[PDB]
Design an enzyme around this catalytic site. Structure first.
Site, PDB file in Angstrom:
ATOM      1  N   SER B  39       0.805  -1.213   0.000  1.00  0.00           N
ATOM      2  CA  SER B  39       0.000   0.000   0.000  1.00  0.00           C
ATOM      3  C   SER B  39       0.843   1.271   0.000  1.00  0.00           C
ATOM      4  O   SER B  39       0.278   2.366  -0.100  1.00  0.00           O
ATOM      5  CB  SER B  39      -0.967   0.010   1.199  1.00  0.00           C
ATOM      6  N   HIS B 157      12.696 -12.096   6.523  1.00  0.00           N
ATOM      7  CA  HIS B 157      11.661 -12.923   7.152  1.00  0.00           C
ATOM      8  C   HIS B 157      12.145 -14.344   7.453  1.00  0.00           C
ATOM      9  O   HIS B 157      11.501 -15.332   7.119  1.00  0.00           O
ATOM     10  CB  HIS B 157      10.381 -12.939   6.321  1.00  0.00           C
ATOM     11  N   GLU B 166      15.714 -16.378  -0.353  1.00  0.00           N
ATOM     12  CA  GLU B 166      15.072 -17.638  -0.694  1.00  0.00           C
ATOM     13  C   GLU B 166      15.881 -18.410  -1.728  1.00  0.00           C
ATOM     14  O   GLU B 166      16.417 -17.848  -2.687  1.00  0.00           O
ATOM     15  CB  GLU B 166      13.616 -17.411  -1.156  1.00  0.00           C
ATOM     16  N   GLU B 209       5.699 -19.162   2.527  1.00  0.00           N
ATOM     17  CA  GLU B 209       5.677 -19.786   1.213  1.00  0.00           C
ATOM     18  C   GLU B 209       5.796 -21.293   1.265  1.00  0.00           C
ATOM     19  O   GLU B 209       5.783 -21.941   0.212  1.00  0.00           O
ATOM     20  CB  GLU B 209       6.798 -19.227   0.352  1.00  0.00           C
ATOM     21  N   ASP B 244      16.703 -15.919  -4.862  1.00  0.00           N
ATOM     22  CA  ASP B 244      16.224 -14.546  -4.713  1.00  0.00           C
ATOM     23  C   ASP B 244      16.977 -13.967  -3.519  1.00  0.00           C
ATOM     24  O   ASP B 244      16.720 -14.348  -2.375  1.00  0.00           O
ATOM     25  CB  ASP B 244      14.702 -14.485  -4.519  1.00  0.00           C
ATOM     26  N   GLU B 292      17.666 -13.498  -8.530  1.00  0.00           N
ATOM     27  CA  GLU B 292      16.696 -12.413  -8.463  1.00  0.00           C
ATOM     28  C   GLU B 292      17.172 -11.383  -7.443  1.00  0.00           C
ATOM     29  O   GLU B 292      17.707 -11.748  -6.392  1.00  0.00           O
ATOM     30  CB  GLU B 292      15.314 -12.957  -8.065  1.00  0.00           C
ATOM     31  N   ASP B 317      12.964  -7.851  -9.511  1.00  0.00           N
ATOM     32  CA  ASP B 317      11.731  -7.888  -8.717  1.00  0.00           C
ATOM     33  C   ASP B 317      11.481  -6.497  -8.147  1.00  0.00           C
ATOM     34  O   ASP B 317      10.708  -5.715  -8.714  1.00  0.00           O
ATOM     35  CB  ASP B 317      11.840  -8.945  -7.607  1.00  0.00           C
ATOM     36  N   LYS B 342       4.385  -9.827 -11.115  1.00  0.00           N
ATOM     37  CA  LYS B 342       3.391  -9.846 -10.045  1.00  0.00           C
ATOM     38  C   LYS B 342       2.198  -9.046 -10.550  1.00  0.00           C
ATOM     39  O   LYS B 342       2.286  -7.825 -10.706  1.00  0.00           O
ATOM     40  CB  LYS B 342       3.958  -9.254  -8.753  1.00  0.00           C
ATOM     41  N   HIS B 370       3.802 -15.532  -7.458  1.00  0.00           N
ATOM     42  CA  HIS B 370       2.894 -15.381  -6.338  1.00  0.00           C
ATOM     43  C   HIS B 370       3.295 -14.175  -5.497  1.00  0.00           C
ATOM     44  O   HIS B 370       4.324 -13.525  -5.731  1.00  0.00           O
ATOM     45  CB  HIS B 370       2.905 -16.642  -5.478  1.00  0.00           C
ATOM     46  N   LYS B 393       7.072 -19.070 -10.264  1.00  0.00           N
ATOM     47  CA  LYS B 393       7.399 -19.382  -8.877  1.00  0.00           C
ATOM     48  C   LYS B 393       6.167 -19.088  -8.013  1.00  0.00           C
ATOM     49  O   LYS B 393       5.757 -17.933  -7.858  1.00  0.00           O
ATOM     50  CB  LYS B 393       8.656 -18.645  -8.412  1.00  0.00           C
TER      51      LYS B 393
HETATM   52 MG   LIG Z   1      11.572 -11.339  -4.724  1.00  0.00          MG
END
Ligand SMILES: [Mg+2]
Ligand SMILES: [Mg+2]
Lengths: 436, 434
Positions: B39, B157, B166, B209, B244, B292, B317, B342, B370, B393
Site C-alpha cells: 500500500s 523474514h 530464498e 511460502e 532470490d 533475483e 523484482d 506480479k 505469487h 514461482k
Molecule cells: Mg523477490
C-alpha cells in the site's frame, strides 16, 4: 440419463502428498471434489488406499485408487442410470461393488471422492446450495453457522518441544456472527504471533501442518497461559475460550500416561488416568477450557466414562470413536464422551457420515466437523457443517489456504443465508435451542 | 452483458483480509480473489487498506470492497460492453480511478474485477481461461512452465543468520509438468528429512511460502543443503537452483551487509563488486541458474555490470516492480534479463499482459510470481500458460494456496493432451519451441 462422465486424477494435498480428485459431469456441468488425508493409518479407519511404490512419492501415490474410479466405479455408476440426487443409492452401490467392511478394495479415498462429487452434482440437480442439499439428506431444516475452533499452539508429536498435549485451540463463542468470529480469531492469532516472536524468537513463529505455532514450551499450563495472554491482549477475554486436543493415546504407556514422553523414558513419572483427570479439572478451574478432545487412551474406556460423568465441559472423541458407528455405539452405551469428531474420510462416504452424525445427535452429543492434517483446496466440509447444523468445526488456524478456504466458504454461506443465518455462539454444543 | 458484480472481504493465506469478487453473466458466476500487495510502494500500484485499528489491526479492505460495490460495478454494468472486451473494460476502470498507481479505488479493487471479467470472458467465448488469455495476448502456442519451488528461507523474514532470502529448485529436466511436481515434492520431502536430522523437528516448520528456515549462518551452507537433498533424492541431473537475494534488504551506506541480522558494524560491509564476485563463485560451485534482486533496487551500475559478466538469468523484482517505466529503464541499461511478473503490482489483466509482452519483445524471460499472501485462487496458473512464459514461482509444494496453482497446472496439462509441451531446459526462452 444423469451422469455423463466420471474422471479421477492425482493432485497434491497441503503437505505435498498425492491424493484423489474426482470430476463428475452432468448436464448442469463439472462438479469437482478432492479427498483429505491423515498423517498416519488408524486401525478402525476405513482404508486409505496408497500405491506403496517406494520410488514414486515414497509409496504415497494414489494411482491405484484413481484407476479404480476410472475403470470400475465410473462405468458402474453411469450404467446404473441412478440420478445424482440419490445420494444413498449411489453410495450403497459403491459399498456393494467394494464388498468389504472397511473399503479395502477400492480405498475409502476412491469411494469418498466420488461420493463428494455426486453430492455436489446432486445439489445442482435439486437447484439448491450444497449445504441445503446436505440438510435435506440429513433431515434438517434450520441451518446454523458454527463456532470455529482455531489451532494456535502445538505440542505432542506435532512439535519438538516438551509440551505433551497435542493442540491448543481458541473458540470465539462471544462473536456476533461467523464473520465476526473470523475477525476475532485472526486478531488473536496475530496478537499471539507477536507475543511468541518477543518471548521465544522469530524462529518460533513458523507454522505446522494446520497453521499453528510450536514454540519451545515446556509445561502444559504455560501454553494455556500463553493463549490466555494473547486473548487478553487482543481485548477479548470474555468472548474467546479455549479448546484442547490432548491425543492421550500418544503418551499412553502400560496403563499409565507419560506427560513427558519426549524426554528420556522414566516410568516413575507416569501418572494414572485418575491423576490425569484431576489435572484436567485444575485446567478447567484456572483457564477458560470448555472442550477437551481425546483426554484418555483410545482403549481406556473406564477413564473416559469416569471423567465424562464427573465434569460439565465438552469431551470429544477422536481416536476413541474414529467416525466409526460401531465404536460410536459403544461410546454412547458406556457414556464415554459427549461429542463426536466427524472426519468424513475416516468413514468413506457422505451417507455414512450423515448417519454417524445423526447417531451422535440423537443421543445428546455434540458433533464437531473436522479437517485432516493433510487438506486440499476443497471446501466441502464447510457446507457439511452448516447442513448438519452441528454448530462447531475445527479446520485449522486462520493461516494456510487449505484452512482459510473452508473459513472463507463459511463466510460466503453466512452472506447467502442473510437474515436467516444463526451463529451457534455459546450454544456450539447444542445449537438446536437457537432457531425460532 | 454483466448482470451483477459483488465484492466481499475474505482472508488470505497469512490470515489478513483481501478482496474477492463475484461476477454474474448469463453463463453463470465467475469468482476471483486478489493476493496481498503493498500500500506504500513508490512505483507499485498501491492496494487500499482501511487502517481501522478496531478491525483486523487496521488491515481491513472494506473501503476497496465499497469502491467496487458502489462505483466500479454500476459503471461497468452501465457500459454495456461484453465480458470478452477485456481491454475496453480494464481501461474504463483505469479512467474511473484516474491515478497512475490506482490509489483512488485501490489496486486490489481494480484487479479483482479485472480477473473476474477475464474468467467471464473465457466462458462467453467458450474457451478455457488460458486459451482466452492466449488470444488476448496474441499467442497461438501453449507451454507448461518449469516450476520454481521455494525450499530454504533467510533474509528479513527468517530468524536465522542467512542474509539471502530464498533458495528455490527448478526441475528443468522433468519429462512434463506432472513429472516436475513429483521431482519437486520428492526433493522437498527429502530436504525435510535432512533438516530434521541435522537441525531438529522444530526446524521443519514452514514460512509463508511453505519453505524451511533452519538456523544456518552462511549462504554456502544453504546451497549445500539444497544440493544434498537433490542428490539423496536422486535427481542431480534434473534439478537446478534459483535464488532470490533481495539485496535491497541489506543495502547500507551504498555498501552491502551480509550479516545485517546480527549487531551492526560497517567494517564488515562489502562493496557491490565484492558481492558480484561471490555470486560468480556461487554460480561456479553450485547449479545456480537464476538470481533475483542481486543488488539494491536503485544500484543500477551494479546490475548492469553483473548482467554483462554472467550467463545466468538475472531477475528484476524490486528493481522493476512490474512497472513499464521501470522496465524500459532496465531494458535500456541492460540491468537484467528476466521480469518477475506480479499481476497485482500492476493492477489489471490487460496491463500485466502488456508488461509481459514488453519484456518478451526485448528478449527477456518472464517469471510469473505469487505474493507472500495468496488465496485459493488459481488465476496465475492459467496466466503463465496463456502467456507462454515458461516459468512460474508460486511456492514450495506445501500449503494449498501454493499447491492450488500447481494442481491447476497439472489439470491444464492433462487437458492439452498431445499438444502439451513442457518448457524444460528452455524455461528462459520457451519460444524456441513454438
Ligand atoms: Mg523477490
Ligand atoms: Mg485429534
Amino acid at each position: 440419463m444423469s451422469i455423463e462422465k466420471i474422471w479421477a486424477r492425482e493432485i497434491l494435498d497441503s503437505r505435498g502428498n498425492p491424493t484423489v480428485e474426482v470430476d463428475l459431469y452432468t448436464a448442469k456441468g463439472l462438479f469437482r471434489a478432492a479427498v483429505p488425508s491423515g498423517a498416519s493409518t488408524g486401525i478402525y479407519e476405513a482404508l486409505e488406499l496408497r500405491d506403496g511404490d517406494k520410488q514414486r512419492y515414497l509409496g504415497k501415490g494414489v494411482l491405484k485408487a484413481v484407476d479404480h474410479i476410472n475403470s470400475t466405479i465410473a462405468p458402474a455408476l453411469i450404467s446404473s442410470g441412478l440420478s445424482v440426487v440419490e445420494q444413498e443409492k449411489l453410495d450403497n452401490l459403491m459399498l456393494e461393488l467394494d464388498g468389504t467392511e472397511n473399503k479395502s478394495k477400492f480405498g475409502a479415498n476412491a469411494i469418498l471422492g466420488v461420493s463428494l462429487a455426486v453430492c455436489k452434482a446432486g445439489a445442482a440437480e435439486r437447484e439448491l446450495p450444497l449445504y441445503r442439499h446436505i440438510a435435506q439428506l440429513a433431515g434438517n431444516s434450520d441451518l446454523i453457522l458454527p463456532v470455529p475452533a482455531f489451532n494456535v499452539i502445538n505440542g505432542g508429536s506435532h512439535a519438538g518441544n516438551k509440551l505433551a498435549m497435542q493442540e491448543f485451540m481458541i473458540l470465539p463463542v462471544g462473536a456476533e456472527s461467523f464473520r465476526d468470529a473470523m475477525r476475532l480469531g485472526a486478531e488473536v492469532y496475530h496478537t499471539l504471533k507477536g507475543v511468541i516472536k518477543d518471548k521465544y524468537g522469530k524462529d518460533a513463529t513458523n507454522v505446522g501442518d494446520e497453521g499453528g505455532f510450536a514454540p519451545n514450551i515446556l509445561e502444559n499450563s504455560e501454553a494455556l497461559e500463553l493463549v490466555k495472554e494473547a486473548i487478553d491482549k487482543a481485548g477479548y477475554t470474555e468472548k474467546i475460550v479455549i479448546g484442547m486436543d490432548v491425543a492421550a493415546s500418544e503418551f499412553y504407556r502400560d496403563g499409565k500416561y507419560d506427560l513427558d514422553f519426549k524426554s528420556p523414558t522414566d516410568p516413575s513419572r507416569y501418572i494414572t488416568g485418575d491423576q490425569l483427570g484431576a489435572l484436567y479439572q485444575d485446567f478447567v478451574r484456572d483457564y477458560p477450557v470448555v472442550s477437551i478432545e481425546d483426554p484418555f487412551d483410545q482403549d481406556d474406556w473406564a477413564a473416559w466414562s469416569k471423567f465424562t460423568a464427573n465434569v460439565g465441559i465438552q469431551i470429544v472423541g477422536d481416536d476413541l470413536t474414529v467416525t466409526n458407528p460401531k465404536r460410536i455405539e459403544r461410546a454412547v452405551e458406556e457414556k464415554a464422551c459427549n461429542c463426536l469428531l466427524l472426519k468424513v474420510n475416516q468413514i468413506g462416504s457422505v451417507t455414512e457420515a450423515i448417519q454417524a452424525c445423526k447417531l451422535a445427535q440423537e443421543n445428546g452429543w455434540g458433533v464437531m466437523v473436522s479437517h485432516r492434517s493433510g487438506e486440499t483446496e476443497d471446501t466441502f466440509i464447510a457446507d457439511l457443517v452448516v447442513g448438519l447444523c452441528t454448530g462447531q468445526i475445527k479446520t485449522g488456524a486462520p493461516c494456510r489456504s487449505e484452512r482459510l478456504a473452508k473459513y472463507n466458504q463459511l463466510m460466503r454461506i453466512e452472506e447467502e443465508l442473510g437474515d436467516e443465518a444463526r451463529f451457534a455462539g455459546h450454544n456450539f454444543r447444542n445449537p438446536s435451542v437457537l432457531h425460532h
